[PDB]
Amino acid sequence: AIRVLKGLEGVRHRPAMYIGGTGVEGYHHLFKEILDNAVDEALAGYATEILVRLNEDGSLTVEDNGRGIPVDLMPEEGKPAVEVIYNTLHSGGKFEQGAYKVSGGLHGVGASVVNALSEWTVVEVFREGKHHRIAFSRGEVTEPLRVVGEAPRGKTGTRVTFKPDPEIFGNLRFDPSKIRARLREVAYLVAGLKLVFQDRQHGKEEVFLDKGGVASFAKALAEGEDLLYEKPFLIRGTHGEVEVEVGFLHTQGYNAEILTYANMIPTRDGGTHLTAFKSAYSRALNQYAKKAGLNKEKGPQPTGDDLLEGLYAVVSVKLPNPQFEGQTKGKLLNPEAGTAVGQVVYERLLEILEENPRIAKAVYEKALRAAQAREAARKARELV
Amino acid sequence: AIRVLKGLEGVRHRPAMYIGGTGVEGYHHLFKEILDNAVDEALAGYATEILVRLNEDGSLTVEDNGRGIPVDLMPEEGKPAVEVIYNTLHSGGKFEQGAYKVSGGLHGVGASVVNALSEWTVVEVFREGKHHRIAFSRGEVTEPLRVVGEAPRGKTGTRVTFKPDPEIFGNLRFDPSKIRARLREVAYLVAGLKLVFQDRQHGKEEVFLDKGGVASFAKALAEGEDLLYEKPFLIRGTHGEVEVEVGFLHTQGYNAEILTYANMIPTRDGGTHLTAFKSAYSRALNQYAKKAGLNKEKGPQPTGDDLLEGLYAVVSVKLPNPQFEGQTKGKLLNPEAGTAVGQVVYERLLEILEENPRIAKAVYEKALRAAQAREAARKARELV
Ligand SMILES: CO[C@@H]1[C@@H](OC(N)=O)[C@@H](O)[C@H](Oc2ccc3c(O)c(NC(=O)c4ccc(O)c(CC=C(C)C)c4)c(=O)oc3c2C)OC1(C)C
Numbered sequence: 001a002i003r004v005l006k007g008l009e010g011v012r013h014r015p016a017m018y019i020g021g022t023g024v025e026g027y028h029h030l031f032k033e034i035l036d037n038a039v040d041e042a043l044a045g046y047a048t049e050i051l052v053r054l055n056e057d058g059s060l061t062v063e064d065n066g067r068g069i070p071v072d073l074m075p076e077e078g079k080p081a082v083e084v085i086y087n088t089l090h091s092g093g094k095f096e097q098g099a100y101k102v103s104g105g106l107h108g109v110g111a112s113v114v115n116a117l118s119e120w121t122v123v124e125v126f127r128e129g130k131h132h133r134i135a136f137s138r139g140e141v142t143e144p145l146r147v148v149g150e151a152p153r154g155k156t157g158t159r160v161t162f163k164p165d166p167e168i169f170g171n172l173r174f175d176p177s178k179i180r181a182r183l184r185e186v187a188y189l190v191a192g193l194k195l196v197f198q199d200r201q202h203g204k205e206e207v208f209l210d211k212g213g214v215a216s217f218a219k220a221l222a223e224g225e226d227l228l229y230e231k232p233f234l235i236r237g238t239h240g241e242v243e244v245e246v247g248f249l250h251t252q253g254y255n256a257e258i259l260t261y262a263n264m265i266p267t268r269d270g271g272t273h274l275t276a277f278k279s280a281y282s283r284a285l286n287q288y289a290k291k292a293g294l295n296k297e298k299g300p301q302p303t304g305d306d307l308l309e310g311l312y313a314v315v316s317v318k319l320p321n322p323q324f325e326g327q328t329k330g331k332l333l334n335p336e337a338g339t340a341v342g343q344v345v346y347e348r349l350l351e352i353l354e355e356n357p358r359i360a361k362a363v364y365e366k367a368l369r370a371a372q373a374r375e376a377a378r379k380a381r382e383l384v
Numbered sequence: 385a386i387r388v389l390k391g392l393e394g395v396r397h398r399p400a401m402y403i404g405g406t407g408v409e410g411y412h413h414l415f416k417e418i419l420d421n422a423v424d425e426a427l428a429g430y431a432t433e434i435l436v437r438l439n440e441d442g443s444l445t446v447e448d449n450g451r452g453i454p455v456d457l458m459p460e461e462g463k464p465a466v467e468v469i470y471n472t473l474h475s476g477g478k479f480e481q482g483a484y485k486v487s488g489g490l491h492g493v494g495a496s497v498v499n500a501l502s503e504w505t506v507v508e509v510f511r512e513g514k515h516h517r518i519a520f521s522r523g524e525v526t527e528p529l530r531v532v533g534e535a536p537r538g539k540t541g542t543r544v545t546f547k548p549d550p551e552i553f554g555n556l557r558f559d560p561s562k563i564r565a566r567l568r569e570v571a572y573l574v575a576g577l578k579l580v581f582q583d584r585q586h587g588k589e590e591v592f593l594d595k596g597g598v599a600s601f602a603k604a605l606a607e608g609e610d611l612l613y614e615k616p617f618l619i620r621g622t623h624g625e626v627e628v629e630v631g632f633l634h635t636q637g638y639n640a641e642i643l644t645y646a647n648m649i650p651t652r653d654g655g656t657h658l659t660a661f662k663s664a665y666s667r668a669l670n671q672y673a674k675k676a677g678l679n680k681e682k683g684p685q686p687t688g689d690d691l692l693e694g695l696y697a698v699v700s701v702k703l704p705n706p707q708f709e710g711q712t713k714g715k716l717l718n719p720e721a722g723t724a725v726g727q728v729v730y731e732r733l734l735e736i737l738e739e740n741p742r743i744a745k746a747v748y749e750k751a752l753r754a755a756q757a758r759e760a761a762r763k764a765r766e767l768v
């Protein structure tokens with residue numbers, strides 16, 4: 001009643017162990033992974049454009065502006081690097097270091113997990129003047145690497161096309177809505193990165209590009225809401241090995257929304273970077289306020305929830321060796337991320353507040369009126 | 385340049401991909417995994433007592449009185465079964481379907497990841513009248529399996545002793561509090577299971593056992609507050625392949641706490657079981673009220689969030705093939721769980737109210753107070 005599953009065999013034996021489930025969520029994790037492989041080329045500074053296309057046959061194509069996955073032979077394995085990448089469960093090396101990378105995702109490079117769980121996979125590489133092609137199916141090579149033609153231009157890059165295996169996912173098909181949502185997210189987290197979504201079926205096409213990045217992301221969060229000031233603030237900075245990006249904006253409403261990210265993956269339960277943000281923001285507001293005489297009688301302006309009212313913000317950090325609560329996602333634990341965020345946002349917020357006095361007053365003013373409202377509801381509720 | 389990592393080599397090459405990080409959380413996941421292996425025997429019905437002892441040298445011993453990991457040879461590999469389970473990255477088969485299992489552990493069986501990340505591991509098996517022993521170090525056999533004597537009093541079971549690899553975690557050491565916390569949780573989730581913690585480093589002892597299960601869990605969740613009744617309700621039932629257990633109590637206070645679990649692991653982001661719980665509870669509560677004539681007309685209408693004030697409950701389900709939203713689990717997606725919790729809870733709850741009309745209307749009126757209190761705070765705030 002027992003056997004050893006070697007390599008990709010294990011992935012097909014227990015798919016849920018690699019993608020959580022075999023439903024709609026798991027189906028799209030394949031898309032996210034291949035997309036993140038492309039996004040990693042952008043993070044490294046080689047890709048500037050990424051195309052995601054839903055083909056009429058249900059398959060999905062992800063093409064990048066990158067270097068193109070290497071096709072030269074790996075001595076130890078006696079096979080092209082691109083073949084090894086998509087056929088071995090876990091491959092690594094120093095190539096994992098030297099640039100920020102998307103965190104979480106599928107086992108190892110993740111690409112081979114997608115291949116194992118796909119009826120067919122086609123990898124095309126434009127590199128060193130040629131257009132290469134290798135085809136797989138459920139983890140195995142069906143068509144060995146070969147040159148199918150010459151590369152145009154100075155065109156280099158990788159184009160991956162795959163179709164999740166119906167033997168595992170049933171009649172599931174890609175959902176344009178979900179694909180667009182992740183593309184919209186990425187464009188925001190990698191400002192300047194152009195991502196195009198093509199849905200051949202409906203002949204639709206949308207471009208996702210935003211130089212404003214996270215600041216724009218913050219405004220996007222307050223879509224149907226009256227803004228306190230139409231221009232969202234952007235805080236950029238680097239501390240140690242951590243790149244920090246924070247964007248925020250206020251609305252005259254009373255709802256809030258703070259999204260946090262670590263290496264391009266949502267961190268629902270926050271972590272060191274989120275706690276460092278709330279803290280730094282609080283430090284800055286209060287400090288500035290006193291200096292400028294915005295506080296009278298020493299009212300209860302803080303209390304955290306008061307400052308959160310009508311606050312829309314996005315905190316994003318990038319760091320090597322990220323540490324998560326468990327299973328590479330959820331809550332960021334790196335203390336250095338906390339120090340980076342706190343450091344970068346505190347100093348910069350002070351400046352932003354000083355050069356934008358009116359706005360600073362309105363937001364601090366809103367915090368006081370929020371505290372009072374809290375007080376009134378408390379007594380009222382503690383009356384009956 | 386590229387390196388293919390075969391088997392356990394990949395675990396030591398990149399531990400965070402298997403345990404999330406190499407700090408305190410990752411360290412304890414090793415403990416959680418070995419404990420889960422023992423608990424699986426209890427879930428299968430062959431184990432009643434698990435001992436967890438923190439040794440003075442930092443190693444952790446986990447002993448269960450279950451069947452004992454088999455030691456016969458696996459012809460396909462030419463090694464005893466115990467060896468295979470602890471030294472191969474992924475082994476599986478029909479044994480995975482024997483019964484309910486703890487979900488979301490470490491890769492595959494999980495034990496081999498622990499072994500790979502420990503400077504040493506000793507596995508003792510009491511089976512078929514004999515006491516077997518086999519030792520490992522960083523994923524590899526150091527002392528092959530051998531019989532070291534008779535099984536004392538013919539007992540059967542597995543005793544695992546291991547020490548997380550200092551080269552991976554530095555000077556970190558198991559935290560008794562984290563251990564007791566998980567042991568307490570498990571005692572509640574598997575009512576009747578007895579777990580003993582011996583903290584030799586502090587000469588301590590402690591028993592975790594509670595036939596009250598999830599009901600007691602709800603009670604202890606509300607420790608500190610005055611209850612509306614000190615006897616927790618217990619709803620248990622099986623619908624399809626899903627076993628459900630829900631416990632709940634009410635306090636005179638205003639705070640609330642609802643914990644959910646799927647196959648022994650916390651689902652902080654809810655899922656089908658949670659949604660179904662509140663719907664079944666809400667339907668049974670509002671229907672009973674109408675039936676017994678409690679829905680007055682001279683006031684506000686009780687809604688969600690109103691009937692969950694001062695309500696402490698724990699919703700726990702066990703089912704085969706759990707489906708989560710990939711990630712770090714977080715949300716249960718199986719529609720069968722929802723129908724299971726709904727069916728089982730709704731009906732049983734209906735009888736609870738009819739059998740406790742006193743408490744029944746005491747709960748409804750409490751929802752009424754919360755309704756007005758909620759609208760009193762609204763008025764107050766809109767008044768600013
Ligand atoms: C799924 O494959 C991904 C890539 O995905 C995409 N879409 O381009 C990308 O995320 C990243 O791609 C890399 C990662 C590292 C190098 C990299 O180190 C290069 N540098 C070299 O000089 C080089 C040249 C030839 C060669 O055989 C190797 C080692 C082989 C590798 C990295 C597969 C390296 C290079 O030219 O391309 C690279 C590329 C395209 O990592 C992979 C391979 C897992």
Ligand SMILES: CO[C@@H]1[C@@H](OC(N)=O)[C@@H](O)[C@H](Oc2ccc3c(O)c(NC(=O)c4ccc(O)c(CC=C(C)C)c4)c(=O)oc3c2C)OC1(C)C
Pocket residue numbers: 001002420421422424425448450451452453454455456465466469479482493495541542543
């Ligand atoms: C890390 O080991 C764990 C176990 O932990 C402990 N402490 O018991 C436990 O969680 C579960 O333990 C099982 C799981 C299934 C069977 C099981 O199916 C049994 N039934 C047999 O008749 C049997 C007899 C000989 C044999 O080689 C095998 C299959 C081999 C196995 C389960 C490793 C099965 C049995 O005797 O013991 C079993 C045991 C002890 O699964 C493991 C092996 C991954």
